[PDB]
């Protein structure tokens, strides 16, 4: 059997069309000086670059 990379299975999710999505980094602390718009720009899920998605797709089974 394959073992899926335990770390990556916790950070990426696959959609209904096979896209691989991430959460934005930088919204855990030092949130005082970050204006409201920056926090919004870091909300939600963002699609991956093609090269990055290829490696994750190929390391997560």
């Amino acid at each position: 059997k394959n073992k899926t990379h335990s770390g990556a299975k916790k950070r990426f999710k696959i959609t209904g069309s096979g896209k691989v999505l991430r959460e934005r980094a930088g919204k855990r602390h030092l949130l005082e000086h970050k204006s409201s718009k920056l926090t919004r720009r870091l909300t939600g899920n963002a699609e991956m670059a093609p090269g990055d998605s290829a490696k994750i797709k190929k390391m997560l089974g």
Binding site: H5, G7, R11, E23, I56, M59
Partner: protein, 100 residues
Amino acid sequence: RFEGGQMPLHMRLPKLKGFKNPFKTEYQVVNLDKLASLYPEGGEVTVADLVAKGAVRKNQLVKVLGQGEVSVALQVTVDAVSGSAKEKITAAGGSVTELV
């Protein structure tokens, strides 16, 4: 999983949000468009009969969903039904009887 020392992709993006439910159950769902082709003359629609027509896995909970249109009367006996599907069935003269 190695980017030449630079922090790996899988180690600088935050973990996914939330927890997971150990007891969540998913229904096998049948849309009205593909349920009006299995019964082109109406009639009663049981779960164990839906299995024999290759519309839902065996040994699960069925839940008719409301995509499409139904033109004939169906007496569906399933585990659940969505609001739009229930309206569409009733409009076509059918009756929806849930088990759950």
